[PDB]
Point group: C3
Chain length 714, copies 3
């Protein structure tokens, strides 16, 4: 009768000073603007206006960013209560069925080895075999992926029992065998030393087979690919391939070494025809949802990327600790897991972990209504994806909303999952092929209200906002051992490409409908969640004040004067007060969150460079595209860097020529414009140093633009 | 050492030729920590690598044994396995010797093919004459 | 004899905080004075950096990776430093 999971508020000892420094920030920031308005510069009037505008924008950004993080909380789970209540011994489990979705598009760019490792890790989760299923969707309809899945299914019969018997962590063979940590830490089982050697010697041969398939699948035979049976591969053309569904492992698929069964594995490839838009990942997700409903009809849908593997085998049980609770399960839309990455530098030069976002902002969002949907590692409720309103304590309309397949409509009514008794399993394959056809979503509500929502490259935020607009809430959980681990990019260009994609998606959402501003005025979305959604969608737009603030130094110092007046009564008091409080809230943030100072400093540097490199181009592309229906993404920081460096050097030299007894202006212009270089220091390291990735054309363009700016100064 | 190297080459060379091992030097190839299963299409490669490593370790043991055994000069001079004394007992009065280890009739490797000819050459040195060393 | 944790790390914390705040405030007050006396300022600048340098592993241990500092220790150190600073006046 005790609660399955417990909500632990942050202790007041850390929470109360946080609010005190927040309100102190508000009071001392509403007066800096007044003091800076009452002191205009008569010799640098446009420059003074630019500085005050930038300060106003930065203050507004800080306010709208710190409001959501007012009341953070934490959550704890008790797996023992799950075992005692539902996962009883000597009795079939009452756990609800779960379906795990994996999506891939191209085996050439994404190697099959990581996809095979993800499939193996998913197939070896600590969950009943008959209550879990896996669906792998290939967008490109690749022959190599099909054979890789077949080999993975063959090897799973040997890999799964070993992991289940010896409690191997992680379940992915590649990452488990690559660990240099002592594997003989707590292995009680006697017959473990001998089995590990054989399993390693078998995994190496499995890798050899996968490499052989990859090497053999580098060129297209002129007569098309041919399967082992002899029939030609239907997906010879990646644009004219009819829908195919294949089941590898299941009830009758085969038995492992121990004689038991394995979780069902289904390979789904949708039908693609020329002249029709498929919406890429969103369309694939909708097709996977419909096929899963027709075939197995799982109660919950966990989305896992191809490059993300299960580091903790009890992630599904922890998710069920939240979803299956009667009181907080009828109003929960999804459970979001934190995203962690391995194989990264010790210093994390590219800040790929995103410590601040994933351990500070997410908790604050969870304090009001829950975290925002971010893609991988999310367990969705099936009834929430259908647009049904939450419960808090018609045939024509049904066909118009869902589709024209009576089997899917009937399977919708099953709120607990499972195949309805009326639906005969003899014809569960033809109906699935009927749903996978490309002409199914025509004249339906799919992609608008039901399931994934189209209209954005970062189509995860829109789906979560649409779900939250109906009154649903989401749950954020942090296991002691991370549930999902992925591979982070190791290139500045790739990282900036993904940041540009996210920012462009946010801008595209902002200009279109379904925004938090003009949409969602139903009365069920909490205002603080509206503020969080507004911040996440708008934060592209703060680039222009940022670049103006970072362009200030050289333009100001090449000319005379500054943004600051002479230090007098009440003049420097606000300066020191604001600076001290800005540094004051940071230590409290690190204290309650547990984030190291180095991670926060690195996040600040990335915030600055990404504010320049990706965000103005996101704004520019969105604005131009809306009003009109590479490697250049790295140039504006280069112009700012060169301009600031040359400017400060020439200005200090000119100050030497002047030789005046004015410490104030020189110190002000010296402390400033070193802040910019320090925040652009990873930029300078990336441009000049080892592992250089800078084309000469970028340097030439930056030099030309800087020359125009320097000539403009005169 | 050259004789033992020629003996071990009969096993090392065919493995490198068949599996395209890079680099060809066993020490530096086995000392690399990079993933060796990068592009190895050949199926019978995992089993052969273990045996080849276990054979290279014994070859290193044999070489170390020879080096340890050849730290002092026997008072009667070095004696070959055949029984005849080593002509180069004195490093200054050794007549020229030429020995061929591997070649057309030297022997066949594990695959039955042949190996490149290996010749050991030691020039004749006499006192009172300058040899110019490397030149 | 005359009478028949984690507090063992506090006195260095008080010395560290007291010295740091002291030297900062004193150099700022010297800036306010703006006098041509290099001797005293240099003597008080070279000194009290010797202490921090000899307590540098202490500062690294308190603040940095692998931190093992309870908040109660920080609170006690702040209180003691406050008493010392008020005693100076």
């Amino acid at each position: 009768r005790q609660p399955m999971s417990r909500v632990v508020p942050i202790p007041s000892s850390q929470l109360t000073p946080y609010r005190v420094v927040i309100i102190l920030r508000l009071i001392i920031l509403g007066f800096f603007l007044q003091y800076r308005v009452t002191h205009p510069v008569k010799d640098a009037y446009p420059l003074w206006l630019t500085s005050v505008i930038c300060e106003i924008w930065f203050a507004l950004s800080w306010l709208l960013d710190q409001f959501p993080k007012w009341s953070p909380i934490n959550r704890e789970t008790y797996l023992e209560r799950l075992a005692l209540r539902y996962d009883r011994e000597g009795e079939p489990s009452q756990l609800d069925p779960v379906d795990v979705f994996v999506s891939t598009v191209d085996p050439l760019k994404e190697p099959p080895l990581v996809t095979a490792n993800t499939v193996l890790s998913i197939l070896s989760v600590d969950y009943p075999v008959d209550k879990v299923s896996c669906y792998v969707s290939d967008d490109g309809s690749a022959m190599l992926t099909f054979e890789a899945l077949s080999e993975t299914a063959e090897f799973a019969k040997k890999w799964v029992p070993f992991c289940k018997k010896h409690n191997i962590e992680p379940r992915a063979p590649e990452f488990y065998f690559a660990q240099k940590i002592d594997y003989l830490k707590d292995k009680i089982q006697p017959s473990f030393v001998k089995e590990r050697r054989a399993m390693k010697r078998e995994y190496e041969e499995f890798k050899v087979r996968i490499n052989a398939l990859v090497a053999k699948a580098q060129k297209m035979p002129e007569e098309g690919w041919t399967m082992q049976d002899g029939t030609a591969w239907p997906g010879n053309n990646p644009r004219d391939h009819p829908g195919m569904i294949q089941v590898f492992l299941g009830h009758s698929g085969g038995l492992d070494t121990d004689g038991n069964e394995l979780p069902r594995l289904v390979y789904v490839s949708r039908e693609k025809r020329p002249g029709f838009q498929h919406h890429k990942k969103a369309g694939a997700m909708n097709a996977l949802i419909r096929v899963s409903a027709v075939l197995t009809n799982g109660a919950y849908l966990l989305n896992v990327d191809c490059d993300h593997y299960f580091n903790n085998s009890k992630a599904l049980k922890e998710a069920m600790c939240f979803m299956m609770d009667p009181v907080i399960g009828k109003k929960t839309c999804y459970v979001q897991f934190p995203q962690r990455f391995d194989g990264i530098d010790l210093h994390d030069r590219y800040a790929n972990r995103n410590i601040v976002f994933f351990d500070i902002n997410m908790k604050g969002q969870d304090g009001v209504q829950g975290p925002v949907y971010v893609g991988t590692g999310c367990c969705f409720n099936r009834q929430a994806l259908y647009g049904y309103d939450p419960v808090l304590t018609s045939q024509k309309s049904l066909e118009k909303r869902f589709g024209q397949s009576p089997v899917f409509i009937a399977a919708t009514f099953m709120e607990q999952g499972g195949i309805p008794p009326s639906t005969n399993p003899a014809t569960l394959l033809k109906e699935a092929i009927h749903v996978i056809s490309c002409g199914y979503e025509d004249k339906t509500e799919w992609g608008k209200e039901i399931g994934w929502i189209y209209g954005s490259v970062t189509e995860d935020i829109l789906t979560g906002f649409k779900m939250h607009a109906r009154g649903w809430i989401s749950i954020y959980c942090m296991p002691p051992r991370p549930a999902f681990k992925g591979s982070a990019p190791i290139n500045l260009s790739d990282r900036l490409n993904q940041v540009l994609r996210w920012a462009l998606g946010s801008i595209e959402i902002f200009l279109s409908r379904h925004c938090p501003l003009w949409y969602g005025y139903n009365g069920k979305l909490k205002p603080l969640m509206r503020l969080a959604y507004i911040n996440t969608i708008v934060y592209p737009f703060t680039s222009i004040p940022l670049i103006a603030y970072c362009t200030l130094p050289a333009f100001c110092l090449l000319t005379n004067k500054f943004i600051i007046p002479e230090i007098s009564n009440f003049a420097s008091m606000w300066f020191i007060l604001l600076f001290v409080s800005i540094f004051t809230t940071s230590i409290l943030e690190l204290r309650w969150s547990g984030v190291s100072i180095e991670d926060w400093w690195r996040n600040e540097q990335f915030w600055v460079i990404g504010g320049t490199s990706a965000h103005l181009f996101a704004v520019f592309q969105g604005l131009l595209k809306v009003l009109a229906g590479w490697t250049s993404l790295l140039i504006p920081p280069t112009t700012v860097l060169i301009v600031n460096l040359v400017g400060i050097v020439a200005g200090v030299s000119y100050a030497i020529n002047s030789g005046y007894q004015s410490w104030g202006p020189l110190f002000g212009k010296l402390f400033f414009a070193i802040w910019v270089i320090a925040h652009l220091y990873p930029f300078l390291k990336g441009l000049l140093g080892r592992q250089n990735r800078t084309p000469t054309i970028v340097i030439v363009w930056s030099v030309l633009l800087a020359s125009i700016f320097s000539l403009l100064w005169v």
